[PDB]
């Protein structure tokens, strides 16, 4: 996945995740980012190049592909990954800033949420759940479910009447779409349990 | 985004941003640079290859694409990012130079603007606001709003009369254009508040 | 293989493998990841570009390629490598966590499985065997053996009657498929012997 | 811009630039090299692929492109950047060599030109000015100004009579050509002032 | 050759090669891996794209290319390099493991083979010779000598009768094939002399 | 130029070059390797893709390109650079090995050739001159001078009679060929003077 300096970033975030945030970070890096960069991205390489329409109308292929794929699946996943990673990155900085200041004023134990960290950790989990569900909704309603069809019927101008068009690798894209949605749903469940851990402690 | 040496550069600039400059740096790196290199750039990959014109005139596609896209959006964003990052890069050097000299003559506290740093920080914010607004204006008047059309009508020589041409992925490009403009506008608001913080202190 | 930071990751996992896990790590990195990254991936570069069908029907090539290659071989291997590497990555973290805590409470000997590490090492080997056999089963039944044919007969809509189609580099792909399957079978045998080593110790 | 080891190279040259050479280094790295690698290079990607000539003569497109673009603009800029960077790279080594020997025989102050460094610094600036003006002259006379035309008229063999040919992205290339020339002219002015600083000191 | 971390790997293996293994490592890295990465690989880039067959039969080009190039030369060389490097990589670890343990139980001299290292070094040389000769044999009998022909005559189904086909860059591929074979033969001679050095010592 | 770890390699060789070998190393890295990687390589990208022949004979383009470009210019330069760099790389190791042993038995002065280093340095320069002249001869006689022609006349089978073919970017390739030859000739003169420095000392 290129870059090169994960060990600092991956190591930095790892040291500042309480109990489940370490499990969440593994699922995020290995099964969402690694899948996207190593397998999924090349699958969508020829999405418009291999888009085939049964017509002789110039410009009909351009508007039919645009109508049915307003935003690419891989571009949607890249935006979603950036949005869910930001609250985790910000909070991990807060723990390092809180720890450094106390050490300066003054035993590497587990990360504990006791003071001002409560309102930043709880909000970060809330933002992660909201962002994750928002992108799942966009995926469902924009593409009419998680299955890609071989044939799309298009009647936008300048296509005469209805034109038949054919998608490239629809089955492979369905397999990867289901994988991302399922892993995304797992991350939602992981975040909810972390809320349950915190809420019962406050209620107790 | 390749490179590899961000941790020094990102870490260096981060340590020398007062209060909002740290929020500004996050929005710049994560939501402007990361989007451009990971999602936006591949969207514009086939801008001229998939440009289709309904004509038989040789050379008509070349002049019509040039007329309606004098400079690509991604090339415009790359220039804008370079121009806004330079004042921040220079001032971060000034803080490190001011701090180092005092240490040589001789408590890592927050960055404070008290002496000659006042005329460099204030000018840096002023330049960033001016650069940000200048590029937003160029985007609006060159492309006639932030929405990309499916069809462009072209009558430049040697095209006979008016020729219909069709843009590649107009909807995807509109979505990313709105995202950059919205994030660019947020950075303008963040810079203005930093001016308000400094101006009231001087007025007090 | 790009990346750049194996030496930390490869060095980290190597130091925490008992006797056979060091042989397993060599076979995994050198004969599965190196083969896929350096040789296999470019073999599948033109899988659909050089797919040729004897027909004049628009859209027939798209549905016939999708029917016979629902998921690419290289994308299947990438998923399999990620799934088998995860249990080994997790357990290597457990050994480092178990060792670090003892040092904090307080002779670099070989890795020994005596306490809570028994239920994590044994499950890690069990998961690796199950994952390895599941992907070998998918390879066999999805593609009807490990040999790729030169000609595939396709009758899916919209292809009229049965259409003859021709695969790109079928012999090269067969050679690499047999190589990956054989190395995958070796890793299964290596894991089973490690179970035999542990089970006799518990039974004794 | 790939590479990865700038921090050593950029850091090394930065520490050995007197007053203006630090401003010169910023303009060189940020507005000449960064522009070339991030924006300019992809603009010239399809210079010959999208070169279109209104003719049926085989081989006419090859000789007409060669006639009007004997050497590409980006390749010209790459050569110019290498030539201007070499004198600065060499002199920066001289300062480090002069400083190291004094330390071995034996207060990090500003770089001062007093002894044998006078004839190396002065010649380095002179070579940089001469190289910069020579490449600006080549740009002007080879391409007949800094504006690229949409249409070129070609009559070289084997093209029959005069053939009309059309350039790819002429407006975008004009924008980047004007930018590089203007920044190159700024570097000339910066170097001349450094000569004025040194010459008055010697005359005094 | 991309990667980035040879200096650790190259430095590690270099420090653990007796007398000729240092000469062997230079020939392997510089004249086998560097040539393949930098020069040879791009020569085979258009092997099937520029494969031309004088026919109108659909699918005839696919089966004729497959028949005459079952596995590409560059893919064959990549497999051979991996197989010959593994015994050297493993033995270098044994020397470092033997040296480290004795130091822990307890003068950086030359590498000496006296104890258990005898059966690992001798087998490593034997495996390297066997692997090198096996791949040379495969190259000879698969491609009928080391010279690539311009024309190949193909009669496999569905090609009607015998079809003439033309290879891309046959002369350049012949030059690089002879270079690898000659360098491969040198490595065989180097390994044999190392056996002669060891065998006479044991016989004495 | 990718890679990433020149600073160790470039720094290592730099510290072990007597007087002229430092100038030689600069010319080699900056004006031979930099030019080839950054400018020359992309010029030859479409050498066969844009090779155009005025004919209807299938396979005629393949044999005519092969006849007139048996080895690519860039592939020739890559081989030459590897051959000339090897003697300098080997000798730099000898200086470090000779120096390290003295330190172990035991004032960083200039590199001096007094003992066994005489027969390795002198042979290294002799090999470099011989290799440099050998590749100059191959360039001249294989391509009939250093100027590339627009038109090549080809009569090899299966081309009927003589076929006219047209080269891609012949003028740009001539400019870079002359540059490499001139810089290569400078390196020959630099090596000869180093022989003159050594020979007079021995004769004295
Ligand atoms: C941490 C744990 C995370 C777990 C996440 C699990 C994700 C599940 C991955 C597999 C997804 C399977 C369901 C989606 C695919 C539905 C379509 C399907 O099954 O296609 C059939 C063949 O598929 C195939 O042959 C596909 C087989 C895939 C093998 C497994 C890959 C891994 C052909 O059926 P059709 O002709 O109706 O296809 C209509 C499409 N155009
Ligand atoms: C830090 C915070 C930063 C916040 C920044 C916010 C940026 C907003 C991103 C979404 C932009 C939406 C508005 C621009 C797109 C207008 C066109 C549009 O909505 O297209 C319709 C469907 O769009 C779609 O289906 C596109 C939906 C995009 C989903 C969300 C992506 C993230 C089709 O309507 P039409 O047929 O008239 O299209 C005419 C175009 N050719
Ligand atoms: C750690 C240890 C790991 C060991 C792993 C071992 C893996 C074995 C690798 C070699 C695989 C050979 C068997 C699979 C290929 C079957 C097809 C075959 O032999 O093709 C024939 C020529 O093959 C050839 O010419 C292929 C020769 C391959 C040379 C060796 C490559 C390394 C042509 O036969 P056909 O015309 O019927 O082909 C029908 C295909 N379309
Ligand atoms: C450190 C400081 C460094 C300062 C460097 C300053 C560099 C200046 C960059 C802008 C260059 C503008 C002048 C050159 C372009 C002349 C052609 C021109 O303006 O084109 C018109 C539209 O251009 C446009 O719309 C181009 C607008 C560019 C927006 C700004 C980009 C940044 C169409 O005019 P036409 O139809 O006659 O075009 C004839 C070309 N084929
Ligand atoms: C450590 C030391 C390692 C030493 C390794 C030595 C490797 C030797 C490399 C050169 C290989 C030359 C012999 C193989 C090529 C035979 C064909 C040949 O010479 O082609 C003729 C022109 O070639 C040419 O003009 C090719 C000249 C190559 C120049 C040197 C490149 C380095 C045209 O003859 P033809 O028309 O019959 O060609 C029939 C092919 N289709
Ligand atoms: C350390 C110091 C190293 C110094 C090395 C010096 C290397 C010299 C580089 C310049 C090479 C110039 C001579 C070779 C090119 C001869 C052909 C030539 O001049 O072409 C004419 C236009 O060229 C042009 O317009 C070419 C201008 C090149 C500008 C300078 C680039 C740097 C058109 O003449 P024609 O139509 O007869 O062309 C016949 C070709 N097809």
């Amino acid at each position: 996945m290129d870059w090169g300096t994960l060990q600092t970033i991956l190591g930095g975030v790892n040291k500042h995740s309480t109990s489940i945030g370490k499990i969440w970070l593994t699922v995020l890096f290995i099964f969402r980012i690694m899948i996207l960069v190593v397998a999924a991205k090349e699958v969508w390489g020829d999405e418009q190049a291999d888009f085939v329409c049964n017509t002789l109308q110039p410009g009909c292929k351009n508007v039919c592909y645009d109508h049915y794929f307003p935003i690419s699946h891989i571009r949607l996943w890249a935006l979603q990954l950036i949005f869910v990673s930001t609250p985790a990155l910000l909070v991990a900085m807060h723990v390092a800033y809180r720890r450094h200041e106390k050490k300066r004023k003054f035993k590497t134990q587990k990360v504990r949420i006791e003071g001002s960290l409560w309102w930043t950790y709880t909000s970060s989990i809330f933002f992660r759940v909201i962002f994750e569900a928002a992108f799942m909704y966009v995926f469902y309603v924009m593409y009419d479910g998680f299955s890609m069809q071989r044939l799309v019927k298009c009647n936008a101008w300048p296509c005469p009447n209805t034109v038949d068009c054919f998608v490239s690798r629809p089955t492979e894209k369905t397999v990867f779409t289901v994988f991302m949605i399922a892993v995304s749903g797992i991350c939602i469940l992981l975040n909810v349990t972390e809320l349950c851990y915190l809420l019962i402690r406050y209620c107790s």
Side-chain angles (χ1 to χ4, degrees), chain A:
Chain A
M1 31 57 50
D2 219 300
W3 204 297
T5 42
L6 314 161
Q7 176 210 309
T8 306
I9 311 176
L10 270 202
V13 184
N14 212 306
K15 298 160 58 64
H16 311 79
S17 295
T18 311
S19 178
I20 296 323
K22 282 152 141 323
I23 304 171
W24 182 86
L25 200 71
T26 277
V27 182
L28 179 84
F29 175 79
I30 305 182
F31 292 99
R32 311 187 71 182
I33 302 180
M34 276 315 297
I35 269 55
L36 185 65
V37 307
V38 160
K41 223 184 180 103
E42 66 219 61
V43 174
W44 271 260
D46 49 302
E47 49 191 335
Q48 194 182 181
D50 281 60
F51 198 76
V52 180
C53 290
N54 191 347
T55 188
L56 262 182
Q57 178 64 40
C60 177
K61 207 202 80 171
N62 272 15
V63 309
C64 291
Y65 179 84
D66 194 58
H67 181 275
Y68 275 102
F69 301 103
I71 189 43
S72 182
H73 288 240
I74 50 161
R75 256 83 75 179
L76 250 201
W77 285 319
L79 290 169
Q80 175 190 6
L81 288 186
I82 288 166
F83 267 83
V84 298
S85 294
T86 307
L89 259 206
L90 293 195
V91 154
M93 297 217 240
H94 203 21
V95 171
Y97 170 60
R98 187 199 203 71
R99 189 185 308 290
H100 191 293
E101 252 179 357
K102 287 179 179 181
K103 178 57 196 58
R104 163 208 56 69
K105 180 212 61 58
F106 171 60
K107 201 180 186 64
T108 48
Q109 209 72 245
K110 302 192 314 174
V111 175
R112 332 269 293 179
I113 283 84
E114 72 289 296
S116 61
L117 252 55
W118 170 271
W119 300 119
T120 77
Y121 214 76
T122 297
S123 34
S124 101
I125 292 173
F126 209 66
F127 283 144
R128 256 177 272 171
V129 157
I130 287 318
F131 287 163
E132 209 98 68
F135 274 98
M136 231 172 282
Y137 188 65
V138 168
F139 259 106
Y140 181 79
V141 314
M142 161 159 327
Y143 285 113
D144 178 33
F146 305 127
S147 211
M148 215 169 255
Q149 302 310 301
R150 280 173 176 175
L151 169 84
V152 286
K153 293 204 181 300
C154 174
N155 60 355
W157 188 89
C159 304
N161 317 308
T162 302
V163 163
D164 274 358
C165 297
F166 297 87
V167 182
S168 157
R169 318 159 178 280
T171 303
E172 196 161 359
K173 291 175 183 168
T174 300
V175 164
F176 278 99
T177 300
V178 165
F179 189 87
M180 302 261 90
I181 293 297
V183 177
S184 192
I186 292 171
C187 283
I188 287 188
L189 290 195
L190 277 184
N191 281 316
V192 162
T193 63
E194 217 163 358
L195 273 187
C196 281
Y197 257 57
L198 262 54
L199 283 202
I200 64 179
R201 149 169 305 122
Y202 225 65
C203 271
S204 81

